[PDB]
Amino acid sequence: MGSMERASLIQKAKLAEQAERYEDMAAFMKGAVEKGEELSCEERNLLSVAYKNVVGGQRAAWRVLSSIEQKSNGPEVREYREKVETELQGVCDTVLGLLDSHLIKEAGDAESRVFYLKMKGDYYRYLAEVATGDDKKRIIDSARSAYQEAMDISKKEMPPTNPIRLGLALNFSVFHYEIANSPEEAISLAKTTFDEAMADLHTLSEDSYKDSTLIMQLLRDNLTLWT
């Protein structure tokens, strides 16, 4: 997207979101990142929404194909599952490449740095969901390490109701439950996060209260499923 203006790529990403053209949206936002400037809060959300929708569709398809493959156990189901898996891995590698070149290293404020480290944990987590080889353990540790650095910053620099801090804790708790086989750690993290946010709600405006309580309900929904 080298010939298109940064502002035009951002505008087109917003149009692509409206049109539910998430592959286009991700391509526009990749082009915007590659301009080399840091991203504002809104632009970070556009980048995250685009890739989360692209990889979300790939993960759903991979799960359908993996289920058919497991029930069947010709080569066609495995071949097609492998094709989808390779495409999914390619998108995760693309996102991780953008974070490494050079979003994370230029992110100095807590809000941006936590945001990008949470993304890094998420995309390693999606790689871990399909991993089966010699590097599976290292993929899981890469997710854990990114989430943990984000957690350490968020606990020092953000209030317990901050929506990024809450969403990071939610996704790290899912990592513990679904990837790391640590359901007790998942439950403890979700409970402590919820309780500390509850005790801080009194400080918030009506609008911030709505933002924080929405994510708290997601933590509670998982705790209801897990306990």
Binding site: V49, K52, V174
Partner: peptide, 7 residues
């Protein structure tokens, strides 16, 4: 188990 949505 649900992770964060985009919007």
């Amino acid at each position: 188990a649900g992770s964060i949505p985009g919007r």
